[PDB]
PDB file of N, CA, C and O and ligand atoms in Angstrom:
ATOM      1  N   UNK A   1      -8.824 -11.071  12.921  1.00  0.00           N
ATOM      2  CA  UNK A   1      -8.261  -9.840  12.377  1.00  0.00           C
ATOM      3  C   UNK A   1      -7.506 -10.110  11.082  1.00  0.00           C
ATOM      4  O   UNK A   1      -7.651  -9.375  10.108  1.00  0.00           O
ATOM      5  N   UNK A   2      -6.693 -11.169  11.080  1.00  0.00           N
ATOM      6  CA  UNK A   2      -5.966 -11.526   9.873  1.00  0.00           C
ATOM      7  C   UNK A   2      -6.891 -11.810   8.707  1.00  0.00           C
ATOM      8  O   UNK A   2      -6.656 -11.348   7.587  1.00  0.00           O
ATOM      9  N   UNK A   3      -7.962 -12.568   8.955  1.00  0.00           N
ATOM     10  CA  UNK A   3      -8.923 -12.860   7.897  1.00  0.00           C
ATOM     11  C   UNK A   3      -9.619 -11.591   7.419  1.00  0.00           C
ATOM     12  O   UNK A   3      -9.876 -11.432   6.220  1.00  0.00           O
ATOM     13  N   UNK A   4      -9.940 -10.679   8.341  1.00  0.00           N
ATOM     14  CA  UNK A   4     -10.583  -9.429   7.947  1.00  0.00           C
ATOM     15  C   UNK A   4      -9.662  -8.591   7.068  1.00  0.00           C
ATOM     16  O   UNK A   4     -10.094  -8.045   6.046  1.00  0.00           O
ATOM     17  N   UNK A   5      -8.389  -8.472   7.451  1.00  0.00           N
ATOM     18  CA  UNK A   5      -7.442  -7.704   6.649  1.00  0.00           C
ATOM     19  C   UNK A   5      -7.221  -8.371   5.297  1.00  0.00           C
ATOM     20  O   UNK A   5      -7.104  -7.694   4.267  1.00  0.00           O
ATOM     21  N   UNK A   6      -7.158  -9.705   5.272  1.00  0.00           N
ATOM     22  CA  UNK A   6      -6.989 -10.413   4.005  1.00  0.00           C
ATOM     23  C   UNK A   6      -8.159 -10.149   3.066  1.00  0.00           C
ATOM     24  O   UNK A   6      -7.968  -9.973   1.857  1.00  0.00           O
ATOM     25  N   UNK A   7      -9.381 -10.117   3.603  1.00  0.00           N
ATOM     26  CA  UNK A   7     -10.547  -9.837   2.771  1.00  0.00           C
ATOM     27  C   UNK A   7     -10.511  -8.412   2.227  1.00  0.00           C
ATOM     28  O   UNK A   7     -10.875  -8.175   1.069  1.00  0.00           O
ATOM     29  N   UNK A   8     -10.091  -7.450   3.052  1.00  0.00           N
ATOM     30  CA  UNK A   8      -9.983  -6.069   2.592  1.00  0.00           C
ATOM     31  C   UNK A   8      -8.911  -5.929   1.524  1.00  0.00           C
ATOM     32  O   UNK A   8      -9.099  -5.216   0.531  1.00  0.00           O
ATOM     33  N   UNK A   9      -7.775  -6.596   1.717  1.00  0.00           N
ATOM     34  CA  UNK A   9      -6.704  -6.533   0.731  1.00  0.00           C
ATOM     35  C   UNK A   9      -7.121  -7.215  -0.566  1.00  0.00           C
ATOM     36  O   UNK A   9      -6.796  -6.736  -1.659  1.00  0.00           O
ATOM     37  N   UNK A  10      -7.853  -8.329  -0.468  1.00  0.00           N
ATOM     38  CA  UNK A  10      -8.419  -8.952  -1.659  1.00  0.00           C
ATOM     39  C   UNK A  10      -9.319  -7.977  -2.408  1.00  0.00           C
ATOM     40  O   UNK A  10      -9.338  -7.957  -3.644  1.00  0.00           O
ATOM     41  N   UNK A  11     -10.074  -7.159  -1.673  1.00  0.00           N
ATOM     42  CA  UNK A  11     -10.927  -6.161  -2.309  1.00  0.00           C
ATOM     43  C   UNK A  11     -10.094  -5.137  -3.071  1.00  0.00           C
ATOM     44  O   UNK A  11     -10.463  -4.722  -4.176  1.00  0.00           O
ATOM     45  N   UNK A  12      -8.963  -4.719  -2.499  1.00  0.00           N
ATOM     46  CA  UNK A  12      -8.097  -3.770  -3.187  1.00  0.00           C
ATOM     47  C   UNK A  12      -7.542  -4.377  -4.471  1.00  0.00           C
ATOM     48  O   UNK A  12      -7.605  -3.762  -5.543  1.00  0.00           O
ATOM     49  N   UNK A  13      -7.000  -5.593  -4.381  1.00  0.00           N
ATOM     50  CA  UNK A  13      -6.453  -6.253  -5.559  1.00  0.00           C
ATOM     51  C   UNK A  13      -7.501  -6.445  -6.646  1.00  0.00           C
ATOM     52  O   UNK A  13      -7.141  -6.592  -7.820  1.00  0.00           O
ATOM     53  N   UNK A  14      -8.784  -6.447  -6.290  1.00  0.00           N
ATOM     54  CA  UNK A  14      -9.841  -6.637  -7.272  1.00  0.00           C
ATOM     55  C   UNK A  14     -10.195  -5.359  -8.018  1.00  0.00           C
ATOM     56  O   UNK A  14     -10.921  -5.429  -9.015  1.00  0.00           O
ATOM     57  N   UNK A  15      -9.708  -4.204  -7.575  1.00  0.00           N
ATOM     58  CA  UNK A  15     -10.014  -2.961  -8.258  1.00  0.00           C
ATOM     59  C   UNK A  15      -9.138  -2.806  -9.495  1.00  0.00           C
ATOM     60  O   UNK A  15      -8.055  -3.390  -9.580  1.00  0.00           O
ATOM     61  N   UNK A  16      -9.583  -2.025 -10.480  1.00  0.00           N
ATOM     62  CA  UNK A  16      -8.715  -1.752 -11.630  1.00  0.00           C
ATOM     63  C   UNK A  16      -7.453  -1.035 -11.180  1.00  0.00           C
ATOM     64  O   UNK A  16      -7.470  -0.243 -10.234  1.00  0.00           O
ATOM     65  N   UNK A  17      -6.342  -1.334 -11.857  1.00  0.00           N
ATOM     66  CA  UNK A  17      -5.087  -0.669 -11.527  1.00  0.00           C
ATOM     67  C   UNK A  17      -5.211   0.841 -11.648  1.00  0.00           C
ATOM     68  O   UNK A  17      -4.460   1.578 -11.000  1.00  0.00           O
ATOM     69  N   UNK A  18      -6.141   1.321 -12.478  1.00  0.00           N
ATOM     70  CA  UNK A  18      -6.341   2.757 -12.630  1.00  0.00           C
ATOM     71  C   UNK A  18      -6.784   3.418 -11.332  1.00  0.00           C
ATOM     72  O   UNK A  18      -6.659   4.640 -11.198  1.00  0.00           O
ATOM     73  N   UNK A  19      -7.296   2.644 -10.377  1.00  0.00           N
ATOM     74  CA  UNK A  19      -7.739   3.175  -9.095  1.00  0.00           C
ATOM     75  C   UNK A  19      -6.708   2.994  -7.989  1.00  0.00           C
ATOM     76  O   UNK A  19      -6.979   3.361  -6.842  1.00  0.00           O
ATOM     77  N   UNK A  20      -5.541   2.440  -8.303  1.00  0.00           N
ATOM     78  CA  UNK A  20      -4.485   2.219  -7.330  1.00  0.00           C
ATOM     79  C   UNK A  20      -3.315   3.151  -7.619  1.00  0.00           C
ATOM     80  O   UNK A  20      -3.168   3.674  -8.727  1.00  0.00           O
ATOM     81  N   UNK A  21      -2.485   3.365  -6.600  1.00  0.00           N
ATOM     82  CA  UNK A  21      -1.430   4.367  -6.675  1.00  0.00           C
ATOM     83  C   UNK A  21      -0.238   3.849  -7.473  1.00  0.00           C
ATOM     84  O   UNK A  21       0.241   2.734  -7.238  1.00  0.00           O
ATOM     85  N   UNK A  22       0.253   4.673  -8.402  1.00  0.00           N
ATOM     86  CA  UNK A  22       1.439   4.365  -9.191  1.00  0.00           C
ATOM     87  C   UNK A  22       2.479   5.456  -8.966  1.00  0.00           C
ATOM     88  O   UNK A  22       2.151   6.646  -8.945  1.00  0.00           O
ATOM     89  N   UNK A  23       3.734   5.044  -8.803  1.00  0.00           N
ATOM     90  CA  UNK A  23       4.842   5.969  -8.640  1.00  0.00           C
ATOM     91  C   UNK A  23       5.378   6.395 -10.007  1.00  0.00           C
ATOM     92  O   UNK A  23       5.084   5.788 -11.038  1.00  0.00           O
ATOM     93  N   UNK A  24       6.183   7.462 -10.004  1.00  0.00           N
ATOM     94  CA  UNK A  24       6.644   8.042 -11.262  1.00  0.00           C
ATOM     95  C   UNK A  24       7.462   7.051 -12.079  1.00  0.00           C
ATOM     96  O   UNK A  24       7.499   7.149 -13.312  1.00  0.00           O
ATOM     97  N   UNK A  25       8.124   6.097 -11.424  1.00  0.00           N
ATOM     98  CA  UNK A  25       8.930   5.103 -12.122  1.00  0.00           C
ATOM     99  C   UNK A  25       8.171   3.808 -12.379  1.00  0.00           C
ATOM    100  O   UNK A  25       8.782   2.809 -12.770  1.00  0.00           O
ATOM    101  N   UNK A  26       6.853   3.802 -12.177  1.00  0.00           N
ATOM    102  CA  UNK A  26       6.019   2.682 -12.554  1.00  0.00           C
ATOM    103  C   UNK A  26       5.595   1.778 -11.416  1.00  0.00           C
ATOM    104  O   UNK A  26       4.689   0.957 -11.610  1.00  0.00           O
ATOM    105  N   UNK A  27       6.216   1.896 -10.242  1.00  0.00           N
ATOM    106  CA  UNK A  27       5.882   1.009  -9.134  1.00  0.00           C
ATOM    107  C   UNK A  27       4.428   1.191  -8.723  1.00  0.00           C
ATOM    108  O   UNK A  27       3.982   2.309  -8.444  1.00  0.00           O
ATOM    109  N   UNK A  28       3.692   0.083  -8.689  1.00  0.00           N
ATOM    110  CA  UNK A  28       2.333   0.055  -8.161  1.00  0.00           C
ATOM    111  C   UNK A  28       2.409  -0.217  -6.666  1.00  0.00           C
ATOM    112  O   UNK A  28       3.063  -1.173  -6.230  1.00  0.00           O
ATOM    113  N   UNK A  29       1.738   0.615  -5.875  1.00  0.00           N
ATOM    114  CA  UNK A  29       1.725   0.410  -4.435  1.00  0.00           C
ATOM    115  C   UNK A  29       1.014  -0.893  -4.097  1.00  0.00           C
ATOM    116  O   UNK A  29      -0.077  -1.171  -4.605  1.00  0.00           O
ATOM    117  N   UNK A  30       1.641  -1.694  -3.243  1.00  0.00           N
ATOM    118  CA  UNK A  30       1.057  -2.943  -2.756  1.00  0.00           C
ATOM    119  C   UNK A  30       1.232  -2.985  -1.244  1.00  0.00           C
ATOM    120  O   UNK A  30       2.383  -3.057  -0.764  1.00  0.00           O
ATOM    121  N   UNK A  31       0.152  -2.935  -0.461  1.00  0.00           N
ATOM    122  CA  UNK A  31       0.319  -2.966   1.002  1.00  0.00           C
ATOM    123  C   UNK A  31       1.078  -4.179   1.501  1.00  0.00           C
ATOM    124  O   UNK A  31       1.787  -4.083   2.511  1.00  0.00           O
ATOM    125  N   UNK A  32       0.952  -5.324   0.829  1.00  0.00           N
ATOM    126  CA  UNK A  32       1.615  -6.531   1.303  1.00  0.00           C
ATOM    127  C   UNK A  32       3.132  -6.455   1.193  1.00  0.00           C
ATOM    128  O   UNK A  32       3.815  -7.312   1.762  1.00  0.00           O
ATOM    129  N   UNK A  33       3.673  -5.460   0.490  1.00  0.00           N
ATOM    130  CA  UNK A  33       5.113  -5.311   0.328  1.00  0.00           C
ATOM    131  C   UNK A  33       5.697  -4.216   1.212  1.00  0.00           C
ATOM    132  O   UNK A  33       6.884  -3.897   1.082  1.00  0.00           O
ATOM    133  N   UNK A  34       4.894  -3.638   2.107  1.00  0.00           N
ATOM    134  CA  UNK A  34       5.398  -2.632   3.033  1.00  0.00           C
ATOM    135  C   UNK A  34       6.484  -3.245   3.903  1.00  0.00           C
ATOM    136  O   UNK A  34       6.289  -4.301   4.517  1.00  0.00           O
ATOM    137  N   UNK A  35       7.634  -2.574   3.967  1.00  0.00           N
ATOM    138  CA  UNK A  35       8.730  -2.998   4.825  1.00  0.00           C
ATOM    139  C   UNK A  35       8.946  -2.083   6.019  1.00  0.00           C
ATOM    140  O   UNK A  35       9.580  -2.505   6.991  1.00  0.00           O
ATOM    141  N   UNK A  36       8.436  -0.856   5.976  1.00  0.00           N
ATOM    142  CA  UNK A  36       8.541   0.057   7.102  1.00  0.00           C
ATOM    143  C   UNK A  36       7.348   0.999   7.082  1.00  0.00           C
ATOM    144  O   UNK A  36       6.828   1.341   6.017  1.00  0.00           O
ATOM    145  N   UNK A  37       6.921   1.418   8.270  1.00  0.00           N
ATOM    146  CA  UNK A  37       5.743   2.261   8.410  1.00  0.00           C
ATOM    147  C   UNK A  37       6.005   3.334   9.452  1.00  0.00           C
ATOM    148  O   UNK A  37       6.532   3.041  10.529  1.00  0.00           O
ATOM    149  N   UNK A  38       5.642   4.572   9.122  1.00  0.00           N
ATOM    150  CA  UNK A  38       5.729   5.677  10.067  1.00  0.00           C
ATOM    151  C   UNK A  38       4.387   6.393  10.145  1.00  0.00           C
ATOM    152  O   UNK A  38       3.392   5.923   9.582  1.00  0.00           O
ATOM    153  N   UNK A  39       4.353   7.534  10.834  1.00  0.00           N
ATOM    154  CA  UNK A  39       3.097   8.256  11.006  1.00  0.00           C
ATOM    155  C   UNK A  39       2.667   8.956   9.724  1.00  0.00           C
ATOM    156  O   UNK A  39       1.466   9.160   9.508  1.00  0.00           O
ATOM    157  N   UNK A  40       3.619   9.330   8.867  1.00  0.00           N
ATOM    158  CA  UNK A  40       3.307  10.043   7.635  1.00  0.00           C
ATOM    159  C   UNK A  40       3.079   9.125   6.441  1.00  0.00           C
ATOM    160  O   UNK A  40       2.502   9.569   5.443  1.00  0.00           O
ATOM    161  N   UNK A  41       3.521   7.872   6.504  1.00  0.00           N
ATOM    162  CA  UNK A  41       3.376   6.986   5.363  1.00  0.00           C
ATOM    163  C   UNK A  41       4.168   5.709   5.554  1.00  0.00           C
ATOM    164  O   UNK A  41       4.536   5.351   6.674  1.00  0.00           O
ATOM    165  N   UNK A  42       4.435   5.033   4.433  1.00  0.00           N
ATOM    166  CA  UNK A  42       5.028   3.702   4.449  1.00  0.00           C
ATOM    167  C   UNK A  42       6.127   3.608   3.400  1.00  0.00           C
ATOM    168  O   UNK A  42       6.165   4.366   2.428  1.00  0.00           O
ATOM    169  N   UNK A  43       7.021   2.649   3.609  1.00  0.00           N
ATOM    170  CA  UNK A  43       8.116   2.378   2.693  1.00  0.00           C
ATOM    171  C   UNK A  43       7.889   1.044   1.997  1.00  0.00           C
ATOM    172  O   UNK A  43       7.501   0.059   2.634  1.00  0.00           O
ATOM    173  N   UNK A  44       8.139   1.019   0.692  1.00  0.00           N
ATOM    174  CA  UNK A  44       8.021  -0.205  -0.096  1.00  0.00           C
ATOM    175  C   UNK A  44       9.300  -0.402  -0.901  1.00  0.00           C
ATOM    176  O   UNK A  44       9.844   0.572  -1.444  1.00  0.00           O
ATOM    177  N   UNK A  45       9.814  -1.626  -1.006  1.00  0.00           N
ATOM    178  CA  UNK A  45      11.033  -1.855  -1.785  1.00  0.00           C
ATOM    179  C   UNK A  45      10.758  -1.900  -3.278  1.00  0.00           C
ATOM    180  O   UNK A  45       9.666  -2.253  -3.728  1.00  0.00           O
ATOM    181  N   UNK A  46      11.786  -1.537  -4.056  1.00  0.00           N
ATOM    182  CA  UNK A  46      11.691  -1.576  -5.516  1.00  0.00           C
ATOM    183  C   UNK A  46      13.107  -1.796  -6.051  1.00  0.00           C
ATOM    184  O   UNK A  46      13.768  -0.887  -6.556  1.00  0.00           O
ATOM    185  N   UNK A  47      13.581  -3.031  -5.924  1.00  0.00           N
ATOM    186  CA  UNK A  47      14.907  -3.379  -6.391  1.00  0.00           C
ATOM    187  C   UNK A  47      16.004  -2.755  -5.554  1.00  0.00           C
ATOM    188  O   UNK A  47      16.086  -2.998  -4.346  1.00  0.00           O
ATOM    189  N   UNK A  48      16.847  -1.935  -6.182  1.00  0.00           N
ATOM    190  CA  UNK A  48      17.978  -1.328  -5.492  1.00  0.00           C
ATOM    191  C   UNK A  48      17.604  -0.060  -4.737  1.00  0.00           C
ATOM    192  O   UNK A  48      18.500   0.696  -4.348  1.00  0.00           O
ATOM    193  N   UNK A  49      16.315   0.194  -4.521  1.00  0.00           N
ATOM    194  CA  UNK A  49      15.886   1.370  -3.783  1.00  0.00           C
ATOM    195  C   UNK A  49      14.532   1.097  -3.146  1.00  0.00           C
ATOM    196  O   UNK A  49      13.814   0.172  -3.535  1.00  0.00           O
ATOM    197  N   UNK A  50      14.201   1.915  -2.150  1.00  0.00           N
ATOM    198  CA  UNK A  50      12.890   1.914  -1.519  1.00  0.00           C
ATOM    199  C   UNK A  50      12.170   3.212  -1.843  1.00  0.00           C
ATOM    200  O   UNK A  50      12.793   4.275  -1.917  1.00  0.00           O
ATOM    201  N   UNK A  51      10.858   3.123  -2.024  1.00  0.00           N
ATOM    202  CA  UNK A  51      10.009   4.299  -2.073  1.00  0.00           C
ATOM    203  C   UNK A  51       9.452   4.569  -0.683  1.00  0.00           C
ATOM    204  O   UNK A  51       9.209   3.644   0.095  1.00  0.00           O
ATOM    205  N   UNK A  52       9.262   5.843  -0.367  1.00  0.00           N
ATOM    206  CA  UNK A  52       8.416   6.238   0.747  1.00  0.00           C
ATOM    207  C   UNK A  52       7.192   6.929   0.172  1.00  0.00           C
ATOM    208  O   UNK A  52       7.323   7.845  -0.648  1.00  0.00           O
ATOM    209  N   UNK A  53       6.012   6.471   0.570  1.00  0.00           N
ATOM    210  CA  UNK A  53       4.775   7.010   0.017  1.00  0.00           C
ATOM    211  C   UNK A  53       3.945   7.612   1.145  1.00  0.00           C
ATOM    212  O   UNK A  53       3.503   6.880   2.044  1.00  0.00           O
ATOM    213  N   UNK A  54       3.722   8.928   1.161  1.00  0.00           N
ATOM    214  CA  UNK A  54       2.832   9.500   2.179  1.00  0.00           C
ATOM    215  C   UNK A  54       1.425   8.935   2.057  1.00  0.00           C
ATOM    216  O   UNK A  54       0.923   8.694   0.957  1.00  0.00           O
ATOM    217  N   UNK A  55       0.789   8.724   3.212  1.00  0.00           N
ATOM    218  CA  UNK A  55      -0.582   8.223   3.229  1.00  0.00           C
ATOM    219  C   UNK A  55      -1.491   9.059   2.338  1.00  0.00           C
ATOM    220  O   UNK A  55      -2.380   8.525   1.665  1.00  0.00           O
ATOM    221  N   UNK A  56      -1.283  10.377   2.327  1.00  0.00           N
ATOM    222  CA  UNK A  56      -2.160  11.278   1.588  1.00  0.00           C
ATOM    223  C   UNK A  56      -2.079  11.079   0.080  1.00  0.00           C
ATOM    224  O   UNK A  56      -3.001  11.487  -0.633  1.00  0.00           O
ATOM    225  N   UNK A  57      -1.002  10.474  -0.425  1.00  0.00           N
ATOM    226  CA  UNK A  57      -0.896  10.168  -1.846  1.00  0.00           C
ATOM    227  C   UNK A  57      -1.642   8.900  -2.231  1.00  0.00           C
ATOM    228  O   UNK A  57      -1.796   8.629  -3.427  1.00  0.00           O
ATOM    229  N   UNK A  58      -2.094   8.125  -1.257  1.00  0.00           N
ATOM    230  CA  UNK A  58      -2.857   6.914  -1.503  1.00  0.00           C
ATOM    231  C   UNK A  58      -4.349   7.225  -1.506  1.00  0.00           C
ATOM    232  O   UNK A  58      -4.793   8.275  -1.035  1.00  0.00           O
ATOM    233  N   UNK A  59      -5.129   6.298  -2.054  1.00  0.00           N
ATOM    234  CA  UNK A  59      -6.568   6.380  -1.912  1.00  0.00           C
ATOM    235  C   UNK A  59      -6.948   6.075  -0.467  1.00  0.00           C
ATOM    236  O   UNK A  59      -6.158   5.497   0.283  1.00  0.00           O
ATOM    237  N   UNK A  60      -8.150   6.465  -0.043  1.00  0.00           N
ATOM    238  CA  UNK A  60      -8.568   6.138   1.330  1.00  0.00           C
ATOM    239  C   UNK A  60      -8.484   4.655   1.645  1.00  0.00           C
ATOM    240  O   UNK A  60      -8.048   4.285   2.742  1.00  0.00           O
ATOM    241  N   UNK A  61      -8.881   3.789   0.710  1.00  0.00           N
ATOM    242  CA  UNK A  61      -8.766   2.354   0.947  1.00  0.00           C
ATOM    243  C   UNK A  61      -7.306   1.934   1.054  1.00  0.00           C
ATOM    244  O   UNK A  61      -6.941   1.159   1.944  1.00  0.00           O
ATOM    245  N   UNK A  62      -6.458   2.442   0.158  1.00  0.00           N
ATOM    246  CA  UNK A  62      -5.034   2.127   0.216  1.00  0.00           C
ATOM    247  C   UNK A  62      -4.415   2.597   1.529  1.00  0.00           C
ATOM    248  O   UNK A  62      -3.589   1.890   2.120  1.00  0.00           O
ATOM    249  N   UNK A  63      -4.793   3.788   2.000  1.00  0.00           N
ATOM    250  CA  UNK A  63      -4.262   4.287   3.268  1.00  0.00           C
ATOM    251  C   UNK A  63      -4.687   3.394   4.427  1.00  0.00           C
ATOM    252  O   UNK A  63      -3.867   3.021   5.275  1.00  0.00           O
ATOM    253  N   UNK A  64      -5.976   3.051   4.488  1.00  0.00           N
ATOM    254  CA  UNK A  64      -6.460   2.168   5.543  1.00  0.00           C
ATOM    255  C   UNK A  64      -5.621   0.901   5.610  1.00  0.00           C
ATOM    256  O   UNK A  64      -5.128   0.521   6.676  1.00  0.00           O
ATOM    257  N   UNK A  65      -5.426   0.246   4.464  1.00  0.00           N
ATOM    258  CA  UNK A  65      -4.661  -0.995   4.447  1.00  0.00           C
ATOM    259  C   UNK A  65      -3.201  -0.748   4.802  1.00  0.00           C
ATOM    260  O   UNK A  65      -2.590  -1.542   5.526  1.00  0.00           O
ATOM    261  N   UNK A  66      -2.626   0.353   4.313  1.00  0.00           N
ATOM    262  CA  UNK A  66      -1.243   0.673   4.647  1.00  0.00           C
ATOM    263  C   UNK A  66      -1.068   0.842   6.150  1.00  0.00           C
ATOM    264  O   UNK A  66      -0.025   0.480   6.706  1.00  0.00           O
ATOM    265  N   UNK A  67      -2.085   1.384   6.824  1.00  0.00           N
ATOM    266  CA  UNK A  67      -1.998   1.625   8.260  1.00  0.00           C
ATOM    267  C   UNK A  67      -2.164   0.344   9.071  1.00  0.00           C
ATOM    268  O   UNK A  67      -1.506   0.176  10.104  1.00  0.00           O
ATOM    269  N   UNK A  68      -3.036  -0.565   8.633  1.00  0.00           N
ATOM    270  CA  UNK A  68      -3.447  -1.686   9.475  1.00  0.00           C
ATOM    271  C   UNK A  68      -2.724  -2.991   9.159  1.00  0.00           C
ATOM    272  O   UNK A  68      -2.735  -3.904   9.999  1.00  0.00           O
ATOM    273  N   UNK A  69      -2.110  -3.117   7.986  1.00  0.00           N
ATOM    274  CA  UNK A  69      -1.546  -4.422   7.623  1.00  0.00           C
ATOM    275  C   UNK A  69      -0.451  -4.787   8.622  1.00  0.00           C
ATOM    276  O   UNK A  69       0.395  -3.933   8.954  1.00  0.00           O
ATOM    277  N   UNK A  70      -0.425  -6.013   9.150  1.00  0.00           N
ATOM    278  CA  UNK A  70       0.549  -6.341  10.201  1.00  0.00           C
ATOM    279  C   UNK A  70       1.903  -6.705   9.606  1.00  0.00           C
ATOM    280  O   UNK A  70       1.994  -7.529   8.692  1.00  0.00           O
ATOM    281  N   UNK A  71       2.952  -6.082  10.131  1.00  0.00           N
ATOM    282  CA  UNK A  71       4.315  -6.372   9.697  1.00  0.00           C
ATOM    283  C   UNK A  71       4.965  -7.393  10.626  1.00  0.00           C
ATOM    284  O   UNK A  71       4.638  -7.464  11.812  1.00  0.00           O
TER     285      UNK A  71
HETATM  286 ZN1   ZN B   1      11.204   2.498  -7.895  1.00  0.00          ZN
END
């Protein structure tokens, strides 16, 4: 399972940044940096604050990885 998730995440990192989610303050979503996960989305740190990103704001691939990556 770990190897499968790593291969999928490698696939995401291989896409152009234009196809990945960016927050209004510039933060690029990275599933490997998820610190908390709920039913509506995930939390990622960004210095002195955390973002919460709803799954629906991510691409389908980004959502899949956000849901399955093991914390
Ligand atoms: Zn931020």
